[PDB]
């Protein structure tokens, strides 16, 4: 029968739930006639009503920790543990509140005017599609909320840990269970993990290969969840969230274009998408795809144990249904993409390259059957035996998630003990032993060739070396004429051997609009899309490493538009933009109509061996700094975000509390006790904090149970007698359960994770991602994969340090720029009065590879990943928390320049921030290196500075007084001089910091100032 | 057969040398030398073979086919070279000596560690009783020396004490009574404890700053300053050339290797940083 | 019986495919395998024992026409013995003792087990105390400019041994032993050299524990592939499964055959053994017989020096 | 918590009953849910003397005992000869843990004399004669956990895993 | 033929005495010759009691006891509790094999029965704190082995391997 009654779960709480409760205006009372239920009933003016007997009695009392962190009745009272104030605290920090103010919807009409846009954006959806109305409303609930300048709301004022919507969007997650448990008692946790994503991104020769490999990861994982968001509604996903997802917004308005809909109401949501889910750009319509891969290649689902094919729902019929479903859907998406590619290429039997692609696809189908990217799927079951005392909830049922989630992650960890590579799946023994491989192209004189892009797979398309191509490309089978070589030679450089998979990658890179075969899925035919693409032809320019290395050269030619052009005037560098080619590279996109043709290959003009002397002369005659061949590969991964989703404290104390320290956490009782108690007592807002801290004192030093339940109770009973209409109290059960909660928290040693925790972390991850998207674009960078926690960009070697600093600060919500529509504010993310949380507790590491543009991207990406993996686990730098010099592991920045390495600690504080004060301390060492590089460039210091610190280093690391070392560095600089009457000293927190390493080939100076000067050596070495 | 005969030879630096490695270390030098696994200065076999092959192609242009056969071919490189060089390993480095004793005046001395001699013996043991050319006396000398590992040993001397490289006092002791010199340059050799020997050695290397001057206003250009590292003149390396049995390998060993004293190794040759004298251990 | 391979200098066992300046606007690079594949040792020993009148087809035919059942390679430093150990993307050298509690360690519950294996690969690992990658950048020089050619630059992560290191194989026939004694060979890629010394030894073979250490890449016969990659948990406790190529044959100058394999250092569950024998045809059994003669399916157990083939 | 005991499962049937319990505690050591024997206790370093059963301990960790933590009290007529152990109960090497133990347990373990009266040499043995598999299933496996023949109409999966899920090292001395 | 003895090595100096007279027997198998503590052995499934110095087993290969095999009879006033067994020397799992295998082995093992009373939190610990470790030289390495400091001027490297070649999981309670 028809189901998914979670539209009732999404409007579960009133829009003024913290203004209705703790009334300031109260005018809404006398002009709309329980306190917060007439409000939730007047916001239901579209669809199915409410059932306070089915949803709120159990589910909302399970989605958030607030119920367990308060107690069933005080979390339900609305009236006892009160505070006339209102705040909104971070989830990871309970110190930084937010002034909320109130110019919210205050009237029966100025709120029905929110109902106006809830109407309009839900009036093209008939009841034909029971889902699509919900599938639409779910996303833009927030969009229409914030489009009106209404400040967002805490979860509820007794515990402002959570916000209004994550407490509302984590309702439906548990609602899946509420609906699949009332019937046949099956709940599931589906987890999709992609195997060898790093090695996959590592395979490629050009940046377009990397970019569409990351896009293949994201699209092949978006395909499988297309069905999950189309069947069980949207709220089936926890990681990654979709509250601010570009992929989901794109797919949503495409599904809106389905069924037949005017292009006149789709714009009313497209504006909310371009404005908030994006940051102003509408290039995702002129590109017809989402511009960046954002799907994290590892995803968690909250499923109800149901299915379709009974014309309606039905209890799932197997223990292994979802696994088979998702594996088959994954293979299905892959083969649909490859067949749509075959058809799009057959649509172009001309152009040479497309013709060669056709010619070799038909030879490699039975090899191209296999997907190039295996996935791991693990599930976990839960039934009513585990949740209910046959009529109600249970005690230790609230912890059932924190147990099943941990079981799931445990099996993920165990299965990750064996890595199988996607190449091991193929059958090649006979194809290599017995010459069977299709060798269209040249022919190897050693059996077969290896793919130059892949490295392991044999090569199908072999390209002759650049000595005479046409006289070979034509007598061989590559090309047909002279015109088609220029288009084959346009994508496959001479000498590029290609395996079927990497050749398919090249094919997709030719026009990356075939991705809509996967990006949408389930929605249009595999041929609708090929027709759409062959109709509106659009070419995209993906930048090579040569384009990134030559960024400032291009930039300095466009500020001499004709003053440099008249010199050449002939070689199409300064000639017309012929077509309307656009691209995802924001700097390329914002600088195209500026005189100079940005689509030239620097490997042709100033990186060539027949030219570049002419171009050296041309640049000499114009004050053009001749380009460096180096670019910055900047990678970054979050610190302990796995443990953080597991509610562990290694995110909070990185290096102090090892992950191995959790096996028997009985040892490090002290730091966990300290910080957890701090967080808990600060998580409250109101007189409730007294109750919780005195409970904690009753938990202090194994004090007592059944005894100290009076001092805490002589205030709880005081509070229930402090009102006029209380009904019943079982304080015996309730205060005991309240102490049992914190006792479990401390005994285990981790904040018990509820769905609201996950959706809050995931939403903040996506929002920080939206911030970093425009931070990369602020520094002429090219994103290969920026998804949430991690990042993989390519920037000039010039603004890598600036970007590192500002990115590591914005990850913690500390910045001064507006980054589109998003104006981050000291730990939060302000979006036009909406204060969304951030991750100011999570550290973040950073890898930087200064690479020559001709360096093989395989080893470059592999070195980047291996640094960011080995080093963060393997390095220890001095830190003090609680006033004691301890060690620390994560949250650093490693640099590498063909042999030089350096590490720059990013926090030097283990609760990396705990006050609003320490927000500026983040990346403080980096601005010092930036200032010092600001002095070296302008000719106030000599680079001899970077070769002269060794002599002072002996003295200074054996040195033991502060101001002694102060003067010592001051005079070391003052032999290369910095200034007249010196003004730039090192800030005296940098000394005594000693970096250790667990005996690895990564050699490093044991001190932070020598590492600062090696970072300067590495940055310069690439300029 | 299959490396029948071998030729070990000494690489005596006539000028300073700089076989470069990019910026391949974590020191303050920006153009370091090629480093061993022990951080000592080494010459890779690629560099040694490439330089020697280039030199021989220039100065024996008629023997180009013999040289191609022994050392490889530019194109049609589907014919394995029947000759090979081992990595050149530092055998001895000159050091400035302020000697206190012996009544004999010395101002520089050859210095080694026991790690260096260990690798030299590794090269040497793997040839003699395996191949057929017999120079066991050198191996016996190196074994006699390696016996005393763990104490600064002087060789062929009466020193008993010295300041090395103006910075290190060391107390020496003769080996037994007397021994044939392993080098023929009449200068004492000292084998030092592997810990003070490497400080002395890394103070014997030449680490210079260098400057690019603005050609008109005679000042340094901004950022036109870097560091380089030369192995000092008179330094000695040690390598072996291994020959697979063939006819033109005999031509190599007869016509060519018997007229090779001086070649050019490494780079920065306009500075004059590559001249080398090859002494074969056959005299 | 035992053959110690003593490298005289850094070595290069190339892990990947193409290493040559094919594309003009790009450098080339390479990374060495920590342990040489058994095909390398086999081809070296054959080169030492070459005949000019045999085979010429299916190299392992006339290769095995000279060898015994070579037993997989491990690391001896100074009489000490180290043994590979492999995880997802990880590879660690450990000694005999640290392998004992490994079966029970992987069945410890979540946090205990992860802490255990994580300490096994970052505290007990003795690799970076005895072997480190020595990056060697090389160039070619055009004799017209005496400068570098266009982008003819290459990296090659060599294998530098900080102390004395041997590679240890065991060989059955003794007439082979006293004909390859003291041979200077071209052991590995890009022309590096190693020495061979042979010493007769004694280690037992017939052992069947629950688990095993793969001292060599276990080759999977490509007809058991899908019958293997659906139920990976049944045969390997931890390690890496990878597509490999058997190398490069010298007499015929071709690249050898690509097969799926279980890389050395992976721990296999005894279920593997019969799973191979019961899922291979006699015609493929004849091929894999030779594949084992050269040394590819070698198992040691975590209790003793338990040398064991798989098919044989 | 509870107390569990020490049993080897060879081709021998002499281990029928000295564990006098049929229900025990709310926790259960080995459970069976139509996939075979689960929660197998593995003991490393204790050779067996299968006839005149008294497991003489060895020193070599390359022998094992595929035992079960057999539920209950050691008949309260033994342990003047046995050993016994109250573990923190994380140390027991239990195969394929189905449930979750709260690491609290005590284990009584039979034991024997070192047997210095003949050269020690153990041999590996597996469970032969699947009919004797069935009969040891009868004598010992049935009357300890009686959910077999209760819900189990599937013997092909519960009697043929014990085929080789239990292998040991017998001395025969 | 001779008989050997596997004396424990905890953080404790309860290893000052195990045998009556200095050396006694004819030959020893464990050797200290210039480059390592050869032929040491590691017993598993057990644990050491640093105070009340004896063995206190805890059965899993996760736990292990590292002891040296010396030729002596245990104090002549005990071996009511000291294991005395005999193995064919190839179940003798020796670490760092260097010497000669005897094939007729007899061992004495310092050990007390578990006598379970405490929750045996069995915690490993290094062999370090050089003040503890240096006085051990001529009473654990020259009270039974006069061979060192006779020819050996190589004590600190066979000290380097002392720093690691012993490891266990003690009792602590
Ligand atoms: N959409 C994406 N595109 C590219 N890279 C991604 C994407 N999502 C995640 N990654 C990266 O790929 C890895 C994903 O994690 P993971 O699932 O462990 O793959 P892995 O690194 O290969 N480890 P494993 O799955 O065990 O093989 C991380 O390094 C991410 O930074
Ligand atoms: N619970 C989780 N949910 C979603 N993605 C996760 C989760 N745990 C880890 N990942 C991602 O999967 C990969 C796991 O790599 P890993 O490095 O172990 O994660 P991690 O928590 O960041 N550990 P580390 O980066 O070393 O501090 C990374 O790409 C993570 O972003
Ligand atoms: Mn991370
Ligand atoms: Mn990681
Ligand atoms: Zn490829």
- Helix (H), strand (E) at residue B230: strand B220-230
Burial of D20 (0-12, 13-18, 19+ CB in 10 A): exposed
Which residue, among A898, A846, A905, A937, has the nearest Cα to A1022 in the 3D structure?
A898
* Full DSSP string of A813-838: T--SS--SS-EEETTEEEETTEEEE-
CA of A201 to the centre of ligand 5 (A): 11
Q: Is D123 near chain E, with CB under 8 Å?
A: no
Ligand 1 probe mutation, A194, A376, A788, A867, most atoms within 8 A of CB: A194
The interface residues of chain C toward chain A in range 153-192, judged by CB-CB distance below 8 A, are 153, 155
User: Is residue A583 within 6 Å of ligand 1 at its C-beta?
Assistant: no
- A897 vs C: CB within 8 A: no
Chain D contact set for E44 (CB, 8 A): 44-45, 61
D87 lies in which domain range? 1-173
Which atom of ligand 2 is found nearest the CA of A642?
Answer: 8
The chains found to touch A (3+ Cβ pairs under 8 angstroms) are B, C
DSSP bridge partners of B239? B9
Distance, CA of A459 to CA of A364 (rounded, Å): 11
Residue ranges of alpha helices (H) inside A262-348 are 266-272, 283-286, 321-346
> Max CA-CA distance within chain E?
48
Which ligand 2 atom is the nearest neighbour of the CA of A637?
Answer: 25
Q: What is the DSSP letter of A745?
A: I
Residue A899 has its nearest CB partner, among B24, B78, B225, at B24
Q: Within 6 Å (CB) of ligand 2, which residues are found?
A: A 239, 296, 298, 300, 637-643, 645, 789-790, 872, 890
Chains B and D touch (3+ CB pairs under 8 A): no
Neighbours of chain C (3+ CB pairs under 8 A): A, B, D, E
Residues in chain C: 312
- C-alpha distance from D44 to closest chain C C-alpha (Å): 10
Biggest alpha carbon distance in chain D?
49
Looking at ligand 2, which atom is closest to the CA of residue A197?
A: 29
| All chains having 3 or more CB pairs closer than 8 angstroms to chain B | A, C
Q: Taking CB atoms and an 8 Å cutoff, what residues of chain D touch E93?
A: 59-62
Closest by alpha carbon to B116, among B88, B138, B97, B135? B88
- Exposed (0-12), middle (13-18) or buried (19+): which is A323, by Cβ within 10 Å? middle
- Tokens standing for B183? 């080098």
Binding-site residue positions of A for Zn(2+): 451, 454, 499, 502
Q: Which of residues 387-446 of A touch B (CB under 8 A)?
A: 445
**Token reading at C210:** 């629950």
β-pairing, C267-269 with D2-7? Answer: unpaired
Question: Quick check: C9 and B87 CB within 8 A?
Answer: yes
Taking CB atoms and an 8 Å limit, are B6 and C193 in contact across chains?
Answer: no
A294 CA distance to ligand 1 middle (Å): 12
| Binding site members of A | 193-195, 451, 454, 499, 502, 637-638, 869
What is the dihedral sign for C-alpha A1013, A1015, A1016, A1020?
positive
* CA A642 to ligand 4 centroid distance, Å: 9
A939:B209 CB<8 A: no
A787 HSE (CA, 13 A, CB side): 23
Question: How far is it, in rounded angstroms, from Cα A236 to Cα A63?
Answer: 14
How is chain C classified by DSSP, letter by letter? -EEEEEESS-B--B-SS--S--STTS-B--BB-SS--HHHHHHHHHHHT--SSS--SSTHHHHHTT---PEEEEEESSS-EEEEEE-SS-EEEEESGGGTTHHHHTTS-HHHHHHHHHHHTTTS--GGGTEEEEEEEEEEEETTTTEEEEEEEEEEEEEEESS--EEEEE-S-STTGGGSTTEEE--SSTT--EEEEEE----------SEEEESS-EE--SSSSHHHHS-GGGTEEEEEEEEEE--EETTTTEE--EEEEE-TT-EEETHHHHHHHTT--HHHHHHHHHHHHHTSS-EE-SSS---B-S--
Ligand 2, atom 14: closest residue by C-alpha: A642
Going from the C-alpha of A674 to that of each of A639, A695, A911, C19, C68, the distances in angstroms are 21, 15, 11, 56, 65
Positive or negative, the CA dihedral B260, B266, B268, B274 is: negative
Burial classification of residue B146, based on how many CB atoms lie within 10 Å of its CB (0-12 exposed, 13-18 middle, 19 or more buried): middle
A with C: 3 or more CB pairs under 8 Å? yes
In the PDB record, what is the listed experimental method? Answer: cryo-EM
| CA A844 – CA A826 distance, rounded (Å) | 17
SS (HEC) of chain D: CEEEEEECCCCCCCCCCCCCCCCCCCCCCCCCCCCCCCCEEEEECCCECCCCCCCCCCCCCCCEEEEEEEECCCCCCCCCCCEEECCCCCCCEEECCCCCCCCCEEEEECCCCCCCCCCCCCEEEECCCHHHHHHHHHHHHHCCCCCCCCCCCCCCCCCCCCCCCCEEEECCC
Q: Give the closest residue (by CA) to ligand 1 atom 25.
A: A195
Distance from the Cα of B78 to chain C's closest Cα (Å) equals 9
For chain E positions 62-91, those within 8 Å of chain C (CB to CB) are 62, 64, 90
**Residue nearest (by alpha carbon) to ligand 2 atom 31:** A789
Chain A residues with CB-CB distance to C31 below 8 A: 859
What separation in angstroms does the CA of A74 have from each of A63, A66, A170, B283? Answer: 16, 10, 21, 99
From A198, A769, A867, the mutation candidate for ligand 1 (largest count of ligand atoms within 8 A of CB) is A198
Compute the count of residue pairs across chains A and C with CB atoms less than 8 Å apart. Answer: 172
- Which atom belonging to ligand 1 lies closest to the Cα atom of A293? 1
Residue with CA closest to ligand 1 atom 21: A198
User: Domain count of chain E?
Assistant: 1
A851 CA distance to ligand 3 middle (Å): 23
Residues 6+ apart with CB under 8 A from A701: none
A121 Cβ closer than 6 Å to some ligand 1 atom? no
Q: Is B122 exposed, middle or buried (0-12, 13-18, 19+ CB in 10 A)?
A: middle
Angle at A593 between CA A590 and CA A599, to 5 degrees: 85
Substitution target in D45, D46, D109 with the highest count of E β-carbons within 10 Å is D45
Spatial contact of A189 and A486, defined as CB atoms under 8 Å apart: no
Q: How far apart are the first and last CA of chain D?
A: 38
Enter the DSSP assignment of A540.
B
Cβ–Cβ below 8 Å for C238 and A417: yes
- By three-state DSSP, how is residue A14 classified? coil
């Amino acid at each position: 029968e028809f189901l998914d009654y979670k539209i009732i779960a999404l409007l579960h709480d009133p829009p003024n739930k913290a203004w209705v409760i703790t009334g300031r205006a109260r005018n809404l009372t006398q002009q709309l006639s329980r306190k917060h239920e007439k409000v939730a009933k007047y916001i239901i003016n579209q669809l199915f009503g409410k059932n306070y007997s089915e949803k709120v009695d159990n589910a909302d009392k399970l989605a958030s920790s607030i119920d367990r962190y308060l107690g069933s009745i005080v979390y339900k009272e609305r009236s006892l543990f009160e505070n006339r104030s209102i705040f909104l605290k971070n989830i990871l920090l309970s110190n930084i509140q937010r002034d909320i103010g109130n110019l919210f919807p205050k009237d029966k009409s100025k709120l029905d005017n929110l109902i106006l846009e809830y109407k309009k954006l839900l009036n093209v959806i008939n009841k034909t599609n029971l889902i699509l109305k919900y599938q639409l409303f779910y996303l833009i609930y927030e969009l229409v909320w914030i489009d009106s300048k209404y400040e967002n709301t805490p979860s509820d004022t007794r515990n402002p840990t959570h916000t209004i919507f994550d407490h509302l969007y984590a309702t439906a997650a548990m609602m899946n269970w509420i609906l699949s448990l009332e019937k046949e008692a099956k709940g599931y946790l589906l987890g999709i993990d992609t195997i060898g994503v790093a090695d996959f991104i590592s395979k490629g020769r050009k940046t377009r290969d990397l970019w569409i490999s990351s896009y293949l990861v994201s699209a092949l994982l978006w395909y499988v969840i297309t069905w999950f968001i189309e069947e069980y509604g949207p709220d089936v996903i926890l990681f990654p969230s979709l509250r601010f997802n570009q992929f989901y917004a794109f797919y949503l308005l495409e599904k809106l274009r389905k069924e037949g809909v005017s292009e006149d109401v789709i714009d009313e949501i497209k504006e909310l998408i371009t404005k908030y889910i994006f940051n102003g750009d509408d290039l995702f319509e002129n590109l017809k795809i989402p511009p960046y891969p954002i799907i994290p290649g590892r995803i968690t689902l909250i499923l109800p144990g149901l299915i379709r094919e009974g014309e309606e729902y039905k209890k799932v019929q197997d223990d292994n249904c979802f696994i088979s479903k998702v594996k088959e859907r994954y293979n299905e998406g892959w083969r649909k993409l490859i067949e749509g590619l075959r058809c799009y290429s057959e649509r172009k039997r001309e152009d040479g390259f497309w013709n060669l692609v056709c010619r070799v696809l038909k030879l490699t189908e039975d090899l191209l059957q296999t997907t190039p990217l295996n996935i791991r799927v693990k599930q976990v079951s839960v039934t009513e035996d585990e949740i209910f005392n046959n009529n109600k909830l249970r005690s230790d049922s609230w912890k059932i998630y924190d147990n099943k989630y941990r079981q799931l992650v445990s099996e993920f960890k165990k299965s990750k003990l064996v890595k199988v590579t996607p190449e091991s799946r193929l059958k090649l023994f006979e194809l290599t032993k017995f010459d069977k491989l299709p060798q269209i192209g040249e022919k190897s004189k050693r059996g077969y060739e290896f793919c130059t892009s892949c490295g392991v797979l044999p090569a199908v398309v072999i390209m002759p070396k650049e000595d005479e191509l046409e006289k070979k490309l034509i007598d061989l089978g590559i090309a047909r004429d002279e015109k088609d070589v220029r288009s084959i030679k346009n994508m496959i450089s001479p000498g590029e051997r290609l395996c079927p998979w990497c050749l398919v990658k090249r094919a997709l890179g030719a026009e990356p609009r075939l991705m809509r075969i996967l990006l949408l899925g389930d929605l249009y035919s595999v041929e609708k899309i090929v027709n759409e693409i062959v109709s509106r032809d659009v070419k995209i320019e993906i930048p090579s490493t040569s384009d990134i290395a030559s960024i400032k050269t291009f930039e300095e030619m466009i500020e001499k538009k004709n003053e440099i052009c008249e010199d050449l005037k002939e070689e199409e560098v300064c000639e017309k933009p012929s077509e309307s080619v656009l691209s995802m590279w924001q700097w390329f996109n914002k600088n195209y109509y500026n005189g100079i043709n940005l689509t030239i290959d620097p490997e042709e003009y100033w990186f060539s061996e027949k030219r570049r002397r002419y171009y050296f002369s041309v640049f000499r005659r114009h004050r053009i700094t001749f380009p460096s061949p180096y670019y910055a590969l900047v990678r970054a991964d979050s610190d302990y975000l796995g443990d953080l989703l597991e509610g562990k404290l290694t995110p909070y104390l990185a290096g102090i509390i090892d992950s191995g320290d959790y096996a028997n956490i009985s040892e490090k009782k002290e730091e966990v006790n300290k910080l957890l108690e701090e967080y808990l007592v600060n998580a409250g807002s109101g007189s409730i904090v007294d109750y919780v801290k005195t409970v904690l004192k009753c938990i202090r030093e194994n004090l007592n149970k059944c005894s100290c339940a009076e001092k805490i109770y002589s205030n709880e009973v005081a509070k229930v007698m402090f009102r006029v209409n209380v009904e019943k109290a079982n304080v015996e059960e309730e205060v005991k359960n309240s102490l049992e909660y914190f006792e479990t928290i401390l005994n285990e040693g981790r904040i018990i994770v509820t769905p609201a925790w996950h959706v809050s972390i995931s939403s903040a991850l996506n929002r920080g991602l939206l911030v970093e998207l425009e931070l990369v674009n602020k520094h002429k960078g090219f994103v290969i994969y920026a998804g949430g926690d991690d990042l993989l960009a390519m920037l000039p070697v010039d603004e890598v340090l600036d970007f590192i600093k500002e990115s590591r600060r914005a990850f913690a919500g500390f910045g001064t720029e507006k980054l589109g529509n998003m104006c981050l504010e000291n730990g939060f993310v302000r979006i036009n009065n909406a204060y969304y949380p951030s991750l100011p507790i999570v550290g973040r590491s950073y890898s930087v590879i200064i690479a020559h543009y001709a360096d093989p991207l395989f080893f470059v990406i592999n070195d980047s990943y291996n640094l960011l993996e080995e080093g963060k686990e393997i390095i220890r730098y001095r830190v003090m928390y609680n006033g004691e010099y301890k060690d620390a592991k994560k949250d650093v920045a490693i640099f590498r320049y063909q042999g030089l390495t350096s590490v720059i600690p990013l926090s030097l504080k283990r609760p990396i921030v705990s006050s609003v004060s320490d927000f500026n301390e983040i990346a403080s060492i980096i601005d010092v290196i930036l200032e010092l590089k600001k002095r070296i460039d302008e000719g106030r210091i000599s680079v001899s500075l970077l070769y002269d610190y060794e002599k002072y280093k002996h003295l200074i690391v054996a040195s033991d007084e502060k101001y002694l070392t102060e003067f010592l560095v001051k005079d070391w600089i003052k032999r290369n001089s910095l200034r007249k009457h010196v003004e730039f000293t090192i800030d005296e927190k940098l000394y005594g910091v000693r970096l250790t390493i667990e005996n690895y080939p990564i050699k490093i100076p044991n001190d932070l100032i020598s590492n600062i000067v090696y970072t300067l050596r590495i940055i310069y070495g690439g300029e | 057969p299959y490396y029948a005969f071998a030729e070990p030879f000494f690489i005596h630096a006539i000028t300073h040398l700089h076989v470069g490695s990019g910026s391949s270390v974590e020191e303050e030098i920006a153009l370091p030398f090629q480093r061993d696994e022990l951080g000592y200065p080494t010459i890779y076999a690629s560099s040694l073979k490439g330089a020697i092959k280039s030199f021989l192609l220039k100065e024996f242009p008629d023997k180009r086919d013999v040289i191609y056969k022994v050392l490889g071919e530019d194109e049609n490189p589907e014919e394995a070279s029947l000759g090979t060089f081992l990595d050149a390993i530092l055998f001895a480095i000159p050091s400035r000596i302020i000697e206190i004793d012996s009544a004999k005046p010395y101002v520089w001395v050859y210095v080694t560690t026991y790690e260096l001699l260990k690798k030299v013996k590794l090269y040497l043991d793997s040839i003699s009783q395996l191949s057929n050319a017999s120079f066991s006396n050198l191996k016996n000398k190196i074994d006699t020396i390696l016996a005393k590992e763990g104490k600064n040993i002087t060789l062929d001397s009466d020193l008993k004490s010295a300041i090395l490289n103006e910075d290190f006092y060391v107390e020496l002791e003769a080996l037994n009574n007397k021994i044939p010199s392993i080098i023929n340059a009449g200068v004492p050799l000292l084998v030092l404890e592997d810990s003070i020997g490497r400080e002395v050695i890394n103070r014997s290397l030449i680490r210079v700053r260098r400057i690019r001057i603005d050609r008109d206003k005679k000042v340094v250009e901004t950022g036109g300053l870097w560091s380089e590292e030369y192995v000092p003149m008179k330094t000695i390396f040690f390598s072996v050339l291994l020959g697979k049995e063939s006819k033109e390998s005999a031509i190599f060993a007869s016509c060519i290797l018997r007229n090779l004293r001086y070649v050019i190794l490494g780079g920065k040759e306009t500075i004059g940083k590559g001249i080398v004298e090859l002494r074969w251990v056959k005299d | 019986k035992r053959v110690l391979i003593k490298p005289l200098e850094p070595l290069m066992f190339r892990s990947q495919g193409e290493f040559e300046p094919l594309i003009t606007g790009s450098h080339t690079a390479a990374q060495s395998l920590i342990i040489p594949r058994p095909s390398t040792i086999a081809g070296m020993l054959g080169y030492i024992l070459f005949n000019k009148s045999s085979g010429t087809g299916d190299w392992l035919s006339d290769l095995t026409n000279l060898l015994a059942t070579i037993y997989g390679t491990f690391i001896e430093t100074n009489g000490e013995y180290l043994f590979p150990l492999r995880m997802g993307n990880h590879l660690a050298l450990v000694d005999q003792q640290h392998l004992i509690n490994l079966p029970t360690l992987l069945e410890k519950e979540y946090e205990r087990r992860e802490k255990g294996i994580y300490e096994l690969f970052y505290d007990k690992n003795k690799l970076f105390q005895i072997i480190n990658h020595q990056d060697r950048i090389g160039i070619s020089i055009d004799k017209s400019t005496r400068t570098v050619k266009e982008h003819y630059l290459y990296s090659a992560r060599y294998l530098a041994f900080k102390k004395e290191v041997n590679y240890v194989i065991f060989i059955d026939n003794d007439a082979i032993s006293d004909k390859i004694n003291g041979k200077i060979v071209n052991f590995g890629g890009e022309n590096r050299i190693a020495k061979l010394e042979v010493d007769d030894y004694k280690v037992d073979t017939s052992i069947e524990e629950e688990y095993y250490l793969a001292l060599s890449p276990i080759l999977i016969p490509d007809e058991a592939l899908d019958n293997f990659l659906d139920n990976i948990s049944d045969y390997v406790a931890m390690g890496k499964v990878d597509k490999i190529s058997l190398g490069f044959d010298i007499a015929n100058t071709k690249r050898k055959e690509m097969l799926t394999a279980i890389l050395e250092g992976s721990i296999v569950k005894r279920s593997i053994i019969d799973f191979i024998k019961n899922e291979i045809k006699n015609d493929l059994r004849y091929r894999f017989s030779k594949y084992e003669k050269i040394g590819y399916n070698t198992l040691m157990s975590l209790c003793k020096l338990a040398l064991r083939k798989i098919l044989s | 918590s509870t107390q569990r005991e020490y049993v080897f499962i060879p081709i021998t049937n002499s281990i029928t009953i000295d564990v006098k319990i049929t229900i025990g505690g709310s926790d259960h050591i080995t459970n069976i849910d139509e996939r075979g024997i689960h929660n197998v206790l593995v003991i490393t370093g204790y050779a067996v003397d299968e006839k005149n059963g008294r497991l003489v301990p060895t020193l070599d960790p390359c022998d094992y005992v595929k035992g079960i933590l057999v539920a209950g009290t050691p008949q309260q007529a033994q342990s003047n000869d046995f050993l016994t152990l109250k573990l923190p109960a994380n140390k027991l090497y239990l195969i394929r843990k189905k449930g979750n133990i709260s690491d609290d347990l005590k284990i009584y373990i039979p034991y024997s004399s070192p047997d210095a009266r003949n050269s020690m040499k153990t041999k590996p043995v597996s469970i032969s004669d699947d009919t004797i598999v069935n009969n040891i299933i009868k004598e010992v496996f049935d009357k300890i956990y009686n959910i077999t023949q209760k819900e189990k109409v599937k013997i092909e999966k519960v009697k043929e895993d014990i085929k080789e899920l239990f292998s040991y090292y017998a001395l025969e001395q």
